[PDB]
Every structure is written in structure tokens, then in C-alpha cells.
Amino acid sequence: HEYEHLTSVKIVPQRPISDRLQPAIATHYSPHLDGLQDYQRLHKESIEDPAKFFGSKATQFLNWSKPFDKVFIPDSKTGRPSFQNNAWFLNGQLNACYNCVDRHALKTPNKKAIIFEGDEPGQGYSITYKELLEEVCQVAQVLTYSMGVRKGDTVAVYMPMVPEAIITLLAISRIGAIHSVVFAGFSSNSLRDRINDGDSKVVITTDESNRGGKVIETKRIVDDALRETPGVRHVLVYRKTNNPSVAFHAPRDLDWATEKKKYKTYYPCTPVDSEDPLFLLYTSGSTGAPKGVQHSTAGYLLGALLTMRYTFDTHQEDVFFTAGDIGWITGHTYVVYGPLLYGCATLVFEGTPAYPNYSRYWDIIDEHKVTQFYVAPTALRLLKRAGDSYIENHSLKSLRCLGSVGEPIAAEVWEWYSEKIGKNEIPIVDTYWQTESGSHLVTPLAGGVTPMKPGSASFPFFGIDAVVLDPNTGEELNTSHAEGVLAVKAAWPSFARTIWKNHDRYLDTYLNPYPGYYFTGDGAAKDKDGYIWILGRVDDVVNVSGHRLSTAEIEAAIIEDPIVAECAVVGFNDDLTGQAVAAFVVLKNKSNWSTATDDELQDIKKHLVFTVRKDIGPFAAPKLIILVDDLPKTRSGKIMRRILRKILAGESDQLGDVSTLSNPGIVRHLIDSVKL
Amino acid sequence: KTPNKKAIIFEGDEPGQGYSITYKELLEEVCQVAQVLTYSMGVRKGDTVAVYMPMVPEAIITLLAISRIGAIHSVVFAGFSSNSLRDRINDGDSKVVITTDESNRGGKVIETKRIVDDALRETPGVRHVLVYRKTNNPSVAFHAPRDLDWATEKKKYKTYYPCTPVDSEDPLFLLYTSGSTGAPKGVQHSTAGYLLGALLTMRYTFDTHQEDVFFTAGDIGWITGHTYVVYGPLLYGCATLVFEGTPAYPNYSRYWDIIDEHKVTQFYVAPTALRLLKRAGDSYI
Amino acid sequence: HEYEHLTSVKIVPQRPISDRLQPAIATHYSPHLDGLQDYQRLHKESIEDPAKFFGSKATQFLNWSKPFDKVFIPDSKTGRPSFQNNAWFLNGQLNACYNCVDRHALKTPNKKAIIFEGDEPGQGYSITYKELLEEVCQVAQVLTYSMGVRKGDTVAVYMPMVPEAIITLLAISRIGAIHSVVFAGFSSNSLRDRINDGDSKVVITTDESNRGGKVIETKRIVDDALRETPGVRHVLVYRKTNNPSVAFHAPRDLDWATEKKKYKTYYPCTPVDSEDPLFLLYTSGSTGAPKGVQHSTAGYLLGALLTMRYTFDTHQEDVFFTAGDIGWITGHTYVVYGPLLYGCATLVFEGTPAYPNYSRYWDIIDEHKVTQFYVAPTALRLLKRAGDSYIENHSLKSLRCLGSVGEPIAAEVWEWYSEKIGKNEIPIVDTYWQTESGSHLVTPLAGGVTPMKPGSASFPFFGIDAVVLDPNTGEELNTSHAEGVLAVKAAWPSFARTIWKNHDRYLDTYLNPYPGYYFTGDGAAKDKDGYIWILGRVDDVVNVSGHRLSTAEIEAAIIEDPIVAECAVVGFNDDLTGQAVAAFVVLKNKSNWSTATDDELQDIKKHLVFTVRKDIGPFAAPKLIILVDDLPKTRSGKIMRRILRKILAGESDQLGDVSTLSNPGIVRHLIDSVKL
């Protein structure tokens, strides 16, 4: 029907796991939610009266310096939380660092907090909670006395993900300062914009870093960016490499590893209001200017805990491995403010599975008994191409939960992941969320809570009353079958509060369209039995005369016929009503790809169009099939479809800064392939 | 608690203009201003913000916003000349001045910006001036280095912002009163003391209720302005009726028209006004 | 249509370059402007509020001795900068030499500043920034103590372009004196006029110089010119040739190389007001008297930096090669006050590509890894004729940006240049500017910023609100298609301030015609989508009954039919309404040219007229086709059409001084060819 292909799948029930438990929890393990029926009644309560649901969890899991008086500010027209004046846990005080480190370090001092593995396989080490406390405290004093940082100021971090970066972020929070984290691979122009927009005065960096065996000159990029910035007074530099030929200017270059020794190993937390900003994330869609999405402390922290507890069903005895950069929202939520806050160990991996040979993730998982593995789908596709030969010698038995985020997962990939890594026993949690939500919006819950469909997030996370709206106007869609856009009826605790120094952009972007609801920006469909499918961003919908076209559905069709490794569907200007469908297809093996073109590539194209035509339909079937070696990908884990769209359209020059991509250089080929 | 209850009822100099502000709406406006003061004007706890505004809703909001961030406010009657303004600004050591461009009282134009600019010529202190463009298109100089447009800056801030804890004995405000001798006296009143006084008075002298409308016929720069326009009825929970003009304009029946139109229940007026109304004669009632 | 032929071209997008980066920047290279959309918004800001755009760049890139108070003096009727009272960075102080040398020499002392290659291939050397500092300082003391030069005085320079000339100009600036540079090849009459008009008292020269293997007697020319000049008190002579038989008179001939050793190797900069004159250029159109165009210090320097940063997208690690003489405005802007100020190395070449064999430029480019190549179009035409056989053994891989200036470039040439030198990868920047603008007015920007049309400058440079005006009167042309003259609505930082000792001429020439706008003097057309085409000087428009005739368009047509090497179109007096069209055409090969004339030259003429007639039209088609061996060319890089016009008209005697040309002697043939 309208997505009949996409949604016509079998429901997979979750099987109990007991035989993958480690001795640590084997004697007491029990899921936090017993079944779907508890989800259903608890969810109901969360929506109907947040005052009690969040009200209680807020004090049971967070350690407050001062109790709060009000759970939330209500909407005058209804008892639900207001979007425009969203605020929670009013008048209480809470220090995020206290809850993340001291709370545990002072009780369970000899428990691993951080497990670190470097780019080169022979290096790594662990840090216990006691040790973390001491490091955080010394850094906080450095910031306080030498860098001159005061409550409410801003500290920019441009570090690679290393233990020192984690420590730094915690130390900043400890003194009531706001942190802002910029992906280490960004160029100096975008760095400069972020530094200036957020008004930082202190920049924390490294001299050089290594990722995938390649050297990244982090100091030089910072020095460049700061040439046009009047703000910054001090730069703190961590000499990860002890002897590089990197300039160092004593007037404002402080050696992280030399300054630290001058400070005491215990230093107190500064009280912070529950609504004070915790951090900013300068996200970007390469339009306008980077948006300093702002999240407050109590809100964000509660969100992160509830998610760890109910989505991933974690325990204090686990190891949570998040395969992603610290500058991304998942870095914050699941590397630093997730497991540490909860009390689980975090596995930190600075490199890429590419180096030295694709078996790296697996080797990591077994060596450290990783129990949770949360990975971007792009990584999964690359691993899948590498082939099953890279997992022949791994049992991966310790894993108890798999999941992914950042882009729709085709059922084809989901099935591979389930069969080869999860061994048909471990549930795969496909979670849907946005930087601005700060936490999961729609997701399967682990344990035995919900049946799963391959390829579909399932039900709204507690407290979020998601609805599919008529895409054009007015009313929602109250029906057994709905196609529209996803939106939320009321605010929740970790909803981004604003955009740094631009509240108008915030309102116009998210709350003014379809007023009354939070506009997600993504398309969606509500299935029979309530599963919510994500159809792709609204902005990328290709309009064909016959019907709206879901990029998620067509891409899912194209990946069948296992000659295809990857694919992106792009609308393209044509003489047709609306737009033509074009597709960028990556073939699995180069040898098949490089052959006499008339001889065989022509049939590959016939097969690809044939499949879409029969399973999705004639309007969808692509006309332009471009067979390429790869697709542009972002650091954040997504195919950068906007680039493909511009190149395909013909405006291949104005792509903005290529250094948003994880594979810059690729554009050279993309342009040639499109032209011919 | 009671978000859709009138907090401020405002009537302008010209009879056809006015509007109401509810408590919910007031919260949002106060919060945005407090952030403006915090981030753009650089105001910090214990600093001093001078206000030279006419009595308009924005002036009320401003005073509340200043208090919200633990700063001390000082209010100068809008009609004062630049010499006395200068003395008050300097004596109180303000660094931030909040004003308007032009205002109208009794049909006459008061050039508030020019007076401030004059006074500040001899003052080394002030770093920023916030200007509310009550009149949208006057020919008033505006210097970007330190003139901030109240109505443009505000939109950049969120609609909820927290209160800063203040000690019960910290100064709430200063009033530079004068008997035209010596120098203006910055009479200082502390927070817990003053607020309790104001509440007890509302409760026992005027016997008010949450359902009333309290109309005080007097300027914000006077002690009764503070006690009965801003920190009185609002604190108690009654609506405040704010009238920027004079009974003189257009014709002496103005106070009466106001009282019946808005069902005023309490009327507190200076005796001088009463004498003038009395002369006008009973034909006006 | 009206220029339909000229403007009917395909847009060429710019391709990313990564594969031409050198290791020096390979790890951190990123363009200064990310795309057209940033150009567009930034340009908007530059026009709407210069106070912030220039205000900030002015302090971020120039090192001020005293900060300025006001960015500019406004026009009473509008917030834009005044033309009549143009002044910038009021009340600040800035020493140009400090910014050009000391600023870098004191930080990066062992970095090449100047790379010098002589006329003879076996000679050349490099000068580092440290070394430059020492040489400049000694010269400044010489000027101060022996030559008696004081702040505000004038020093004339008549040197060949050699390292010593560069040093001299910097040294003059260092002591607050005004320099004036005269092309070394000028005769004594025009030298005398420039010396006297500018009131110099000190003349700096050489004894003999060699260009193209020929000897230029620079001392004798100066001695001649000074016979009628009561002013000059001292002449400083650099004995480039150590043993020539050149008179030297001790009373006022100082040996540059003997005097210098008496001075210390460090000497301070004198504070100079931001509006003090930096230099004069005695330009000439061979009418009236040479115009001492005057440019002030802060204005000019900022212009030069912004251009280097945004048009050429340079980095500190580049080598910028400008193929042109120091006495021309591009000499100043791109040999001395450009790269040095920025921090790039300058490649200085004293000779001509003609010697020894046309491969010289290429040999230079590869030997020194030149990354930027900026050349006059006349040079390109000569190289093109020489033929592709002279580039068979060069990769020219290091080049990342090509460009040209001084005359319209036919698409035919543009394409050749792009294909054979730029290898279809490097962008070609066709930049339009004037001595009086001091910087680019209309130009493509490098990097990926703009699509390019062959043959058309693109968009106005930041801060310049260019408009096409009705050529006859009043109002501008607000339309999708406009033909008129180019003008600018408001002043910018490096607009010439005046004409030395003749402000009235300045006003009458540039601001009084079409009052309210700066009158460029060149014709222009605004295309669809905003590209600005330059149609040639207004003064040379040939008026035919049918329509105004653009010399640029017709010349572009004539160069097609690749038998034609070069061409100039000249209006000529006839019995026709207005004037006839005449053309001087140079054929590529002499052997084809020298043959039985009735037999073949007659068909060449038929073909040439045929093409113009069909592509441009019947009114344009030439009547007089004169086939010649060459065209007169200037030192400044232009066909000296005025000569051709006079000879053709019949007044072949009154040509003024032939020694303005790079090929004097040519007139002998031009006269014979025209007559017959």
C-alpha cells in the first residue's frame, strides 16, 4: 500500500537471556520492566500525571543539594508540560559532576569507570572511580585558578576522544561552567564560528592526535581559528604526543600535564540550579550558522538515567560500548553522562574499525566483555561489506544487547546484524531521537518488554506523547493507518530549552510550524498495532505525481539483491511532474564493478530498477542509477544526502565545507561519476 | 498557580489605548529581561541599575527583572533635569541605565533619551544604556556601541529563567529622595523587611483580597509607587492599575472614567490631586 | 542579442582541489570562504554596514601602533562611505613596513620572503624574512642620514625589478617617506616630468640592467632627465653590474653597496597616520600629464590583504608569482605589498618569457613550486602562439590557481589557458580593476566559491556596490538585462584619494560625470544571474548606425578561426554614419602570411569578415582588414589601441612618445601596413 512493502514484516518476540549473564549478575539479574503490560500502564501514568512519575524518579536517582518544589510548569490550557515555558524541578539544585563521579567514587572506589583503548591495539588502560575523582578535581582547580574560569563562563573543547577529554568535561561541569565540544576533525573556519558564537574564553585542546593511523594537527587548527577571535584568553594543551614539533607560547599556552600537579586531589562541587545550562552542542545542517543547542542540567541528567535504566536495561556491573565521537549528542549521552551517572563502566575507543583490519570491534568486545553495543548504522554497513570472514574467530558471547542510531536501518541490515553478531538471540534496539530531544523519543525497550519489527522503532519513550500529524494541515491522524509527520503533544524533561543567543530561531524552527506541537521534522507512519516507522526527513521527500515518496522505503528496496552494498536515493530535477528518482548505488565488490560496462553494468542497472518497480512501484523506480565506489558520510553517522542532491542537480561547487564528512576527498569521485 | 489572572491593567495617556497583562505573561517578560541584564548588560548580583523610565508596563517589568538577578534598582522621576539625574547616577554608582526614547504625559513630549545622554556626559561609570522605543519612529540618536534596543535584544532570550537567592538583609532598592539640600539621599531598604511591611499593610490597612484592583494615583519614582504599584498588589496577588497620564488630560473626568471602566475597588490618591479635582467641580462626576 | 554572442556561454563549476596540495598544507588546508552562499551573505553585510565588516578585519589583520576611532566618514545623505571625503580608520597609526617585514621576520625568521630569478637562468637566490629585515633597516638609515630623507619627502625609484628595488620600496616606507616608481624602460622626457611633478629630491637607480638579454642604460637616462631638474640633491646608484663604463660623480652619486655597510642592521619604524600617503603612481594615457595617483596607507594595505585572502585564497605556505613590472599597479599590489604583508613568498622574475625560449615561465613554475600564477593576457597570447611544444615536458602540478589582468580575455584564450596550463582543474580568475581602485572591483573568487563563465569577471568584491548605469543619463539600470557603463555607488578603503597636486582633475575625471557615482570609465553589461561583463573602455566605443559596438565582443569573434593569433578593433573615419569598423589582425604563422597575396590573403580576409558577420552581425563586420606581423603593446599589458587609431586615421605622426610600448620599433611596420 502506502508503505505496504516497508511495513509488511513479521514480529520477532524477544527471547529470555540467562545464558549470557556474567557471574557478577547471574545471581540477582532481573529486568527493570517485567513486560509490555507494565510498559503500557507505566507509560499511561507518565503521560497523564508527570508530577508523580518524574517527580519521584527525579529524587530517587539523582542526588540533590537542595530539593525542588515543582516538578514542572503547566500549560494554562491543560495539565501537561508547556513547550514555550518548559522547565522542570524548579528551585532545586544539583551538581552534575557530583552525581557522575563523586557519588560513586566515594562509595565504590575500586570499580572501573573508564576502560580505554587507543588507536594502536597494544595500548590502553583502566581508570577507577577513585582515580577519576582525583583527576577531575585537579583539573577543576586548574580551570579555576589558572585559566580564570568562573561559574557561567564557557569552555570550548576540541579534543579527540581520549580519557583526558572525558575528565575535562566533568571538571568543567564541576565548577558550574558550560562546556561546548567541537569535533576534532573540523576545519578552522567552522571552529572559529563555534568559538565566537558561544563566546568561549577558554579553549582546551591537544597537540596532535592519531586516528586510523593518521595524524590530526589539532593545535594548529586551534591557533588558526583563534587568529580572528578577540575572546580567548587562555589555551590549555594536552601533550598527548610527548615530543612533536609543535609551537607552544608561554603567554597563553598552558601545559595540561604540568599545571595539574600544582593542585590538590580533592576539590568540591559548586551548586548549580536545576535549570542552569549544562552544555551546548553546535550542531549543523550546513545552513545558516551552527546552532548552539542548549540543554539544562536536571532535565538532561534525568533523561539520560531513565534511558539507561529502561531502554538498555543496564546494571551496575555492565560495560557499555558506544561506537561514536564525543562531539555528537550520543557521545554526551552515552559515553560521558550515561554510564558514569548510572554507575556502569564506559568503554572508550578513540580509533576506527577500519584500522588495522575490521576485526577490531570484535576483538574489543571479547577482550573487555562488552555487554552493550550501540553503533551507528553506517559502521554496520561497512562491517557487513568487509564480510563474515572477519568474525570467524569471535563468539561475542558477552553481548546482551545490540542497538543503533542515526539513520534508518534496512531490514536487510537488521537481519544480518541479528544473525551474525547477535546470533539470533540478542535484541536489536533501533532507537530514534534528535539532538534536541536529548534522549530517546521512540524506541524498543530491551529485556523482554517488547516484540520488535525489523526496521521500526516501536513505541514512544516514557513521557513523550508522540502523534502522527496530517502533513499538510491541522488535525492529527486518528486512525489505524496513518501517514504524516511526527510530532509531540507536550514537553518532557530533557527537551532542548533553547538555541544559544537566538531564541527566535528556536521557536520558528520547532514550535511555530504546526503550532501546538513539537515538530520533529521527520516523516513517519503509524502502523497497525502502533509501531512507528520513520520515513526519512520531511525535507527530502521526493514528490512524484503518483504519491509522496519515502526515501527510507525506497532505499530499503534497493539494498535487496545482495550485489548492492549501500544506497542513497536523491530527488532530481526533471521534466516530470515534481522530480525524478535518482539513486547512488555502491556495489559490494570492485572486481564486479570494474568490467566492460556495456557488457555487465547495464544489467546491474536493469536489475536494480526491476526490483524497485515490482516491490514499491513504477513511480518510485529510479531512472538515474549511478554506480559509485562510495557515498559521502558524516562524522555524526549519516549519508550526507544533501551533497549528493546538489552534485546531482548540477550545483556541485556550492557544497560548503567538505570537512563535515568522515571521508572528505570522496567528492572528487562523486562529481566525476555524476557527470558521466 | 493562577496563570490566567490579571496582574497589570494598563491605561495610557491617550484614552483609546491600553491592555492587560496576566501573571503568566508577566513571568515570561520578566524572565527575558533578566537574561538581557545578565548577558548583554553585564549586570551581576549587587550591582546597580538606574531606571529613568516613565511609568509604563515595561518599567514595572524592568524593576522586577532587576530584583530577580539580585541587583539593586534605583528609580529617578522621568521629569527630572540632567543635573539632578547626574548626581543620582553617580552617587549610587550605577553602571547600567534603563530608559525610553520619548514619552507622553498630558499630551506633552518628554525627551527622556536626550536627558540621559546629557547626564552621562560627565559620568565615567555607565557602560550600557538600554532603550525602550516606546515611540517607534522618532528622530532620536541611537549609538550601537552602547545603546541596546530593548525590543530587539529581548527576543534572543528564553522565556523562563530562575531567581537568584538573596539574603533577607540585602538591599532591595534605593530611593534618591530630596528636600533640595545637601545632596539626594539614597534611602536604602532591605528585602525581607520591606516586603513584609508592604504585605501587612495591604492586608490590614486596605483590607484587600485577591480579587481586587488597586489603583494608586502616583509616579513610580515615589515611595508610594514602589509600595503600592509594584511591590504591593503584585506581592499580595491583587491586580495593579497603572495609569501613565494625568487627570488633567483630556478633561478631569478621566479618573472617574477609569474607575468605572475597570471596576477599581481601591483608590489611593495624593491630596493635591483631590484639590484640583474639587476645583474642577462636581459637573465632572 | 546585444552581446548575445559574447554572453552565451556555459557555466563552469569549480572542482575541489586536494590532489595539488603540498605536504605543507595538506594536513590543514581549508578555503577561507566555504561557498557562494557565504559570499552572498558576507557581501551583503559588507555593503550594508562597513563599520563592522571592515572595522573588524582592519584590526584582525593589521598591526596598529595606535588604534583607530572611526572606521569611516559617512555621507550625510546615507550611511555609506562618502566619495568626496573618503577616509578610513581615522586617528589610528600604522607603519606599512612593520606589517610587511618586521611582523613576520620577528616571528618566522627562517622562511623565504623573496625568491629571485634573474634574466639569465643560472642565477638566482632566496631571501628570508630575517635577511630582509636587516637589508631594509640598513637602507632606511642610508636614506635617513646620507640622502637626507625626512618624513613626507619623496623618493623616486627608477630601478629594474630586482630584490634591491623591493628592499628600497620597503625602506622608504619605513621612514615615512612617499615613494614613486617609474618603469625602467621610460625615456628621459617622461622621467623628467614624473620627477618634477612629484617633487622628488632623491632618486634611486641602477647603473645598467639586462632584460631579454638587452642592456638598458638606466644611469644615463636618469642623468639626462636631471639636467633640467633643480630639485634633486642626491642620487643613489646600485651597481648591479660591477664593472661597466658608467660615469659616477662623487658630489652626489652614492654607491648603494658601499654606503650600506656603515649602518646598523636594526632600525625602527616611524609612526605614520592611517591616512598618510603610501605611494604615488604616475600613470599615463599619453594625454595631459602623468597622473600621480595617490593611495593612503591603511586603506591600501587592508585592500591588498583582503584580496590575497579571499580572491586568491592564499596561505602562509604559498609562492605567489606575478608576471609583471614593479612600476605597474599590480607590481605594488602583488609583488611587494601583497604576499609580503600576508606572509607568503614572492617570486620575483626580472626578465621576459621570450628569453631564451618561451619555456621559461614553465621552467620557473616547476622549479620553485609556484602555486599562484597571475599573468597579463598579452603574455598569454604570445605563449599560445609559441605553441604547445613548449610545455610538453612540464606538469605544472603545483599550481592551484591561475588568473589574469589588464585586458579582456577572449573565451578562446581562456579555454586554451584552462586546458593546457590549468589542465581543466585549476580555476582561472579573470579580475577587473583599475589603478584608482587599488584592489579588485569585480572578480571570481578562488576556492569553490563561484561558478565561472569564460570571459567574464563575476561578482563585485566585498564592499563595492557596483552598478550598471544608463550610459547617457540619470538612472541606473534595474533589469535582468543591462547595457551601460560601470559605476560604483559608494567609496571603499582603497579607493585612490587624489591626484598629486591636482584635486580638480581628480574630481572632474572620476566623480563629476554621472555625479553621485564613481565613474569607472569602462563599459559593461549585466547578464542574467548577475555576471558582469566588461565591454571595453567607453572612449573606444565605435558608433555604428545600427548600435553601439563593443570592442570586446567583436575582438572575441575575430580570434575564432585559429589562423588568427591576435586582433584589435579600431573605429575608423568613413562616409558611413558614425564610423567604420577596421581591424588589425595578426596571423599565427609567417609562412602562411607571406605568400602570393592575391592567391590567399584575400581569402583570409573573406573568412575573417564572414565570421564576424554571421556571429555578431553586419553592422559590426569589419571593412578594413589589415594583416600585420604584430600589434603595439604596453609595458602595462595592453594593446595600445590609441596608436592604432591614430595611424589608421592618418595622423600617424602625432603618437607621442613611443617609449610607453614594450615593443617600440613596431610603429615602423604599422605605418607601412596601414598605408598599403
Ligand SMILES: CC(=O)OP(=O)(O)OC[C@H]1O[C@@H](n2cnc3c(N)ncnc32)[C@H](O)[C@@H]1O
Ligand atoms: C548532529 C546531527 O545532525 O544530529 P541530529 O540533529 O540528532 O539529527 C536528527 C536526525 O537524526 C535522524 N535519526 C536518528 N535516529 C533515527 C532513526 N532511528 N531513524 C531515522 N532517522 C533517524 C533523523 O533523520 C533525524 O531528523
Ligand SMILES: CC(=O)OP(=O)(O)OC[C@H]1O[C@@H](n2cnc3c(N)ncnc32)[C@H](O)[C@@H]1O
Ligand atoms: C597604468 C594603466 O593604464 O593601468 P590602469 O589605469 O589600471 O588601466 C585601467 C583599465 O584596465 C582595464 N582592465 C583591467 N582589467 C580588466 C578586465 N578584467 N577586463 C577589461 N578591462 C580591464 C580597463 O580597460 C580599465 O579601464
